[PDB]
């Protein structure tokens, strides 16, 4: 009865559904098959996939389909993070059914589930490969066949937490996931004009959908302890003569009351210990002990990763606090807080089911007049939003600019030599920065910058470092030799590629952006900024401007599309890390400055307009990098000056 | 066969569809009835409605429904712009079917189809009544019954041209229509939390859907002639000793070549006449004659409406140019330009049909997990977008601020006395404005401002005018007595109401925001700014900041919803008038400064944060009102400084 309006809706269509053994993907495959499509279900676990296939074939036979074994195929052991496995999947699908009509890019992993400053770089990369690069890879293999037959559909299964057009959605402790989700949407938004008229490309962005939850609440409490201890140590080290090593030594007796009562301990640590005592459960050992071995190891990793010098065995003798570190009452109160928080987002006060979200998606797939859209099959959500794309701004206050006098500035980049030169000269000549550390990618880049900045190089004001693919080690060299940075400007080392984004109908697409080229694009234009943001925040940088690629009136149409893909995708990272930093009492101000515009007609057309643009660039960078004075960083002003993006 | 997946989808539902005799509305009513709903179709023309009803009943009988006369009812002579007619419609619907399940707010009019500076105020109001106020009115009559039964659905039929969350879409020559469309979407976005869990409220925003077109192209050419003549006369009057009367006298021989060749004619007019000759078709009389009687009457209306003094019979003897004024070749080239422009927006390169858009809408209506959303049943569009909601900005350049010395400032408002006082004092004490004209609504408001600004009142620097409901006449008084304005700041006279937005389930809703209160809200918070924008642009004001209502940490939850409704809706007006002004070579810079935030948690919580907010307010107003210096207003910088919005 419920399937009566579904049967026949997609008759004759061939669909490939990744992550098709469970969740929304399993339901999408089920309903597409009931609607008449022949489906290929891909997943890792063979058993789960075989059970799903059997349940679907059984339901197909129940409603009257015959030869059900020919309508539902499976591709077990398929790990979408592997390019070789994606090639095998396409070969198996085409061998079974011929040309794919619908590519349902559903497979997704949760990701690292850590704040950026605890996120391994290889972990971030793995999330991008599984959740985003896999979507491009499957489209690159299937779109040529779709265009040749004259029709096709690519559906990327994004999330509400991937943001929307002109608004980023911060997703703390999930930056890798949020970026992958936003990239899935951005891919649909920028490829639509290229894939049209033959192929439709859209995203779906569902919100939340329907023992370990107590384990997760305990992990939140352990993360909160880590954050508070790390923030206070970082803050104490800024204004104390003691080294980070000597400061960490105050924590070794692991006694909250003794730290609070120590007249010689820095104010940030004494005030923190007071908070541990006040806010703590007296039955919990976390109210009398500062940390445990697990928090201590994670704290040590943060300090080491921020270039702070400490022996690896500093916590070897740390007294072990008695169980419970956090009481069952504390853990249950945090679990209820998480639960009520999610439920509280819902305007309709009811959790959508995977079945209902899939039904709405399968009806949506019948619509032939949409491309570049993000459909919300579930929605009505109360959640923090960060609008992006504002272009009307001015210089910061003279009080914020005065804070630049005597500062250590780090500039990162290579391709944008003119921007790098003007920026170094603005900080040194106009705002009295003590020194600029120019971190480039190659020796050729280093030489070009040294020649452009010869006067400041000879005066010892401009120092150059060659990073190669080792940006973290390059920042460590800068820290040891020149001191920790105040303001940091991160531009991409590489320009955007100029290859086609789609091929001619009767061509083999041999020159079209390859799967490896798309991964390289994500590395140079997304991972680049993440690695810098992670390292600079850990290294106690005062501010960080993330700069997107430049588009001009002469940039190719493909470059405009890729630039806009990056700009949208990076906005998710900027908004997330900005909220993460703010919520955990980190000083760093992280914002994005966009050199990419949506259309050619908006770009400067003459030398006067170009001069106006370059001056706006400097003003935009100063607006986000001039440090906030002592009293100015209120709860109100703090949220304004973090996770924002402005277009030059 | 095509209806096989539709039959039974909405069985047992009662739907009311306004504008149900034709277009998308007619198709929505048709498909809802085929899906099993009982439908009431409302429209003005009885004949069209009777034909639609007969076609639907015939199709219902064909697919097997019985007693088809009981499934499809009509409500002829229903003009949705009339409150009395909306009450009659609800009575007829409830009498026929009982409680309405689905309210399909489809009725819409094209509106005035004029630039704001040619738009009659009563025409704007009529568009709001028909397209937006009618949507609230029907929801206010039907939502109590829906909540009592425990379920309901409100669908507002908006447009892609109504913008989206965090982005406004400029729609030149359609500001009234664009605002009505954005308000339909904003209504769904802000009422969703209040209407949940029982009632869903969403918008649909289709893009373009499938002899007079040549008539429209001719009207575009006549409008272009008007704009060029009006812009040159306004510009000439700024730097010429001749009055507007003497300047208009140069046009009376109606000879393009004689105007160009006149050594004593202002440069703006001579350069314009050169352009008429170069860009004109030699076979068209528009290449040798400046205007015709129709353009002359519309030009005279603009000048009179801008307070320029000219006799009503100034064009009585204007020589009539011989036909054709514009050749068939010129008209056909413009018609093709309009056509290709629309087609060129489409990524899928095919115009969607009313049938297909309605089908996608009827499938969407089955989704029970969405509220506050805007579904795009057709999409994939290449079009100009204006992101809104940016909050990171600074002061303008000292070159822009120097332009304020000796200026005549107009401040409009009443409720926001603190904002008005600080603004008058900033312009007079910090930036050396010659005088501030304070235009308030009432004598009590005038007295309050005079007391707050006593020192500037005694020095003859602060002048007060009481506008009442006659803002245009108040501006004319300011022009005659104090001179034309440079910068203008428009704040609302009224605060936001504090009445409930929904009623308790078993209540009569007697205290809930009435249909008359919603119309009053649109008058004080939308029409107020339109009337000011229209008058100031016509009066050659240099800049105009449109200021939305203020929300604080203590504002009621209803006030936050209404403030956000206004902020979204006004962004459509600001973006449209900004592009209209830019495209027609008008100098005026029109932008919006928002005192409304999306959530309470973002607001200042203490006196320090409040001081920070008020200083950001002044900075935001200076950023958009400081005039652009002589060479700075390039094509590039011009688009940046118009139609934008920033949140304090």
PDB file of C-alpha atoms in Angstrom, chain A residues 112 114-121 173-175 223 226-228 230-231 234 298-306 530-541 573 577 580-581 584-588 590:
ATOM      1  CA  UNK A 112      38.514  11.463  12.773  1.00  0.00           C
ATOM      2  CA  UNK A 114      38.584  15.258  16.842  1.00  0.00           C
ATOM      3  CA  UNK A 115      39.225  18.967  17.035  1.00  0.00           C
ATOM      4  CA  UNK A 116      41.573  20.154  14.243  1.00  0.00           C
ATOM      5  CA  UNK A 117      44.471  20.542  16.797  1.00  0.00           C
ATOM      6  CA  UNK A 118      44.178  16.781  17.704  1.00  0.00           C
ATOM      7  CA  UNK A 119      43.450  15.677  14.081  1.00  0.00           C
ATOM      8  CA  UNK A 120      46.202  13.554  12.411  1.00  0.00           C
ATOM      9  CA  UNK A 121      46.972  14.899   8.894  1.00  0.00           C
ATOM     10  CA  UNK A 173      35.151  18.246  16.336  1.00  0.00           C
ATOM     11  CA  UNK A 174      34.122  17.245  12.753  1.00  0.00           C
ATOM     12  CA  UNK A 175      36.100  19.660  10.435  1.00  0.00           C
ATOM     13  CA  UNK A 223      38.268  16.462  25.836  1.00  0.00           C
ATOM     14  CA  UNK A 226      42.344  18.502  27.914  1.00  0.00           C
ATOM     15  CA  UNK A 227      41.152  21.832  26.362  1.00  0.00           C
ATOM     16  CA  UNK A 228      41.050  23.708  29.665  1.00  0.00           C
ATOM     17  CA  UNK A 230      46.003  23.152  27.250  1.00  0.00           C
ATOM     18  CA  UNK A 231      44.460  26.668  26.977  1.00  0.00           C
ATOM     19  CA  UNK A 234      49.464  28.104  26.404  1.00  0.00           C
ATOM     20  CA  UNK A 298      47.030  13.820  24.381  1.00  0.00           C
ATOM     21  CA  UNK A 299      48.196  17.080  26.068  1.00  0.00           C
ATOM     22  CA  UNK A 300      51.846  16.163  25.519  1.00  0.00           C
ATOM     23  CA  UNK A 301      51.069  15.456  21.799  1.00  0.00           C
ATOM     24  CA  UNK A 302      49.487  18.951  21.467  1.00  0.00           C
ATOM     25  CA  UNK A 303      52.552  20.667  23.120  1.00  0.00           C
ATOM     26  CA  UNK A 304      55.100  18.662  21.061  1.00  0.00           C
ATOM     27  CA  UNK A 305      53.071  19.350  17.852  1.00  0.00           C
ATOM     28  CA  UNK A 306      53.168  23.098  18.730  1.00  0.00           C
ATOM     29  CA  UNK A 530      44.154  22.600   7.179  1.00  0.00           C
ATOM     30  CA  UNK A 531      47.800  21.636   7.855  1.00  0.00           C
ATOM     31  CA  UNK A 532      48.736  25.330   8.376  1.00  0.00           C
ATOM     32  CA  UNK A 533      45.661  26.021  10.543  1.00  0.00           C
ATOM     33  CA  UNK A 534      46.361  22.900  12.678  1.00  0.00           C
ATOM     34  CA  UNK A 535      50.085  23.771  13.124  1.00  0.00           C
ATOM     35  CA  UNK A 536      49.593  27.565  13.730  1.00  0.00           C
ATOM     36  CA  UNK A 537      46.788  27.034  16.340  1.00  0.00           C
ATOM     37  CA  UNK A 538      48.957  24.418  18.141  1.00  0.00           C
ATOM     38  CA  UNK A 539      51.926  26.903  17.918  1.00  0.00           C
ATOM     39  CA  UNK A 540      49.923  29.738  19.588  1.00  0.00           C
ATOM     40  CA  UNK A 541      49.737  31.994  16.500  1.00  0.00           C
ATOM     41  CA  UNK A 573      36.645  24.489   7.400  1.00  0.00           C
ATOM     42  CA  UNK A 577      37.760  25.785  13.236  1.00  0.00           C
ATOM     43  CA  UNK A 580      36.115  25.147  17.791  1.00  0.00           C
ATOM     44  CA  UNK A 581      38.763  27.721  18.800  1.00  0.00           C
ATOM     45  CA  UNK A 584      37.714  26.101  23.847  1.00  0.00           C
ATOM     46  CA  UNK A 585      39.110  29.527  24.961  1.00  0.00           C
ATOM     47  CA  UNK A 586      41.906  29.501  22.283  1.00  0.00           C
ATOM     48  CA  UNK A 587      43.084  33.052  21.495  1.00  0.00           C
ATOM     49  CA  UNK A 588      43.723  32.456  17.729  1.00  0.00           C
ATOM     50  CA  UNK A 590      40.932  32.284  12.154  1.00  0.00           C
TER      51      UNK A 590
END
